[model samples]
Target: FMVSLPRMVYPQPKVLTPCRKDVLVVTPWLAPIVWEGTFNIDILNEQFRLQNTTIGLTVFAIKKYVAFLKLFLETAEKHFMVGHRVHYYVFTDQPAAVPRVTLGTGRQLSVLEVRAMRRMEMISCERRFLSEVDYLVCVDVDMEFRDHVGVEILTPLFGTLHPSFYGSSREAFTYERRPQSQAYIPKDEGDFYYMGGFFGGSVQEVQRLTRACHQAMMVDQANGIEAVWHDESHLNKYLLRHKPTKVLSPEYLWDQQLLGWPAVLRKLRFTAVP
Candidate 1:
């Protein structure tokens, strides 16, 4: 007969463990810092596969950025989302020029044509993305996967720590200072610095973020004030107020050539061309 395990014998509820003992592994708000030791890929894979999670990877490869697609897609096939259903949405100006890189069995690619300069439009079109996939991963095209980047990083919402200033204090973060800008943030109100190059969440939450950022950009445009880092600055502001459900460590985004593989980094999952 089928029987439930006794409470005494049942194992603990699944939870993420601290990856780094020396540094802060989780934020005060409870978002995990997805460092190397923080996750067991086998455990995470089972959970996500059971749910049949479908991840949508959104990237804007405008103008010269499009040149990186061939290598990016080929390398991604070797590492990113290996066993899951992934729909790669490549928004670019030259759809015809999109590399015909072959994809895995359960993975596919859609080349979307958009104006090269309209980055906001490229990202804010998440409403269409909702109809196609379960989650959205917004990333820059000028990147390549160098190691395993699978379901272990999946969450309701997540952001990657920027490689340049992951250890910097809030005061040292590069935020827009002018009050007139929609992306402005005071020096005292941040948890962690997030890179605009990589971020993801559930379809609904991603839509909310992109929509909010788009609107905020419009507000700043009307006021004739662009933030220091523009979209990235706006992204930091939103994450400060909204807090991500998970925080990816620098392992998910790194450049060994620029920032040599430090001792703290157990693995460098994704890297930029130096």
Candidate 2:
């Protein structure tokens, strides 16, 4: 059960005024598409802190990716879920190569030597996570936090919109078109192109998603088929059917080099490292 928050003074919310009229803030399913200026961090910080939420962030730093961990962890310490407890789980084959970056109070790091099949690896850790944290955020290692990415993003289930396809039409999305593959999404169907690089939810929901995706991939392999974008295609298909409780705007995940900064993105929270 959740508790009531104490009275705090802040600017009164205007029901008549919208947060952002320039872009879509809410999805058809009524899930908030998180964007900058759409939420007040102080309010969200208090709400999450009250619950003593412990977020477990999982990242794959296998092989060459381990080189990106220093910057990734350093920037994350500066921006991600500040004022809350964080557990950084780094899965890498070369555990010794993992950088020893200093962490803040109430934050810790764990190096889990593992191999991928990315979804498979995540599924394997579900049991351990069930007892360690309240929420799990799975992301790629080659990205760094550039702005505030705090508790406002925590939800039962959530997926980030692909930076390249957010504004494109459904037909233009690069969904797996082969009906033979388990990740197939006919050109006519799809809600949004969810990036496989970043996604997470409550431990239960994330486990469910990872398990389902791994099973689907196995099925596809048995049939001598492979999805176009591999795990990304499977992730898109899963989100299409399950419908995430919250949808993260492209601002949550972006590549400034490939797609130059646009006026629509008020802040690039987590971005690809060039």
Candidate 3:
């Protein structure tokens, strides 16, 4: 059963409440970024099956998108095997069937029934309880993992504890922070730029951040200041001011960020097939 979403708050809370139950925080050390294109497929496969990895994907109801969802789950089966756990939170207005994909790997998956929140309201919809797992990947089911992007992103997640933040193009930063308000920046330092496309931290980290971001969104929604990219922008700014996470390299999740690259080079890179 899904956990209930707590009441939304206005005038966002400054302090994030800690989880009631204790959770062992897994700290992965910070490491220099590497080119994922260089990962040896054979060696990478071992890492996938062994790591107690779990991904949380947020999706909407699109009858047509069900096939896309299946491909995504099927791909995870091939990549993570049956040992890993993949939880798909399908927050849709109308439920769609997710095929039972038994790829002989021990990877288990479940399509959660969630209320459809606007793209901007994603964090709000996600507020409706979640699973306790090692990691929570805030992704769109329209996207899929290619190679070990899952494991690759997990690097440096816990070391600095900036929420294992990843970097996205400044251009892709769809959500805008309040004008000239140092909402998402360090006090001494300056400059905030990021997109909430695909972000991760520990499940607990995400749970905490989500509450902060979600509260901020509620305040904005309650007030007349309805912003664009509601939840995305709220999260972008929330982490910006708060965690100041690692600026992940574009190669880690190359997409629109790869636009200017040469054609052949793009092919060599491991981009998800949606």
Candidate 4:
């Protein structure tokens, strides 16, 4: 019922057809880079629903970042995993300020009082919340779900390509260059520069990722060094070695203001606040 994965691929006869030939669809690791024309939402919905999937979304709305919640949660109600079960775990210092946004059926919210500086430890704390949901969709608080981002993205492991550099060469990627840091990634190695602001997977994988990032961050802290992109640098290194089961296209995390919506993107599923 969990949409038994690692699907089979078939080669058609010569002169048959090239489906989605124009799109950059698959990753170097062979995981599908989900985008429009790469999937059918209705089919994906049915598949995940059959498994009774529950998605846990984690957002950190500490300090003034709390202001982004109203529109964020409202738009989420409109687009994110529309018909499936959703649990919104909001980590905030000002729980009293969190908007009492109304959610659809099979959805709920929980306010957690956590300090702002401890954002690095947030995902790692997900271990205690595991039994509550089947999967986790960890994203930043200052963003909104803009389109259909549903079970089509559900996998044991997955990361969304950072919109700023998804098409850039590896050398252009802003990875941690200092060898002293645990998050260091040599110029020669990297599949995609994934955004820490938007990432998630099965409970086990998310836990593994969170723990690993937190550990690496601690090591860097002890060494008097921080990764160039903070937690995101560590994430790139982890995904490079562990490899995500699926790679979401830039459509999953875009900034229309920074980088205008190009013709390449059929649907901008999520966007940054600014």
Best of the candidates, lDDT = 2
Model 2 over residues 1-274: C-alpha lDDT tens digits?
7899889999888999988999988889999899988998888998899999999999888878889999999999999998999999988899999989999999999998876355554554867899999999999889999998999999999999999999999999999998899998887899999999889999999898889999998999899998999889988999999999899999899999999999999899999999
How big is the positional error of residue 135 in model 1, measured in Å on the Cα after superposition? 0.8
> Across residues 31-136, which tens digit of lDDT does each residue of candidate 4 receive?
9988887776656776787788999999998789999999999999999999999999999889999998999999999998876524557767665668888899
TM-score attained by model 4? 0.92
Candidate-wise lDDT, in order: 0.83, 0.91, 0.47, 0.86
TM-score of each: 0.91, 0.98, 0.60, 0.92
What are the per-residue Cα lDDT tens digits for candidate 3 across 34-125?
34333343444456445555555455545556666666666655553234555656554445466666655334444556553144345434
* Candidate 2: 10-residue stretch with minimal lDDT: 115-124
TM-score of 3: 0.60
Which 10 consecutive positions of candidate 1 have the poorest summed lDDT? 1-10
Point out the higher-scoring one by lDDT: 2 or 4. 2
Per-residue lDDT tens digits for candidate 1, residues 1-274, read 3233323332444457433677677889987777876666766776777777898988888788889999889998999999999999888889988899988899999888876514655666656777888888888788899998888777788889999999899899888888888888888778777998899899888877878888898888888888899888888889988999999989989988899989998889899977
Candidate 4 lowest-lDDT run of ten: 5-14
Query: Which ten contiguous residues of candidate 3 have the minimum total lDDT?
Result: 156-165
Q: CA lDDT of 177 in candidate 2?
A: 94
Stretches off by above 4 angstroms in model 1 are 1-19
Cα lDDT for residue 271, model 4?
93
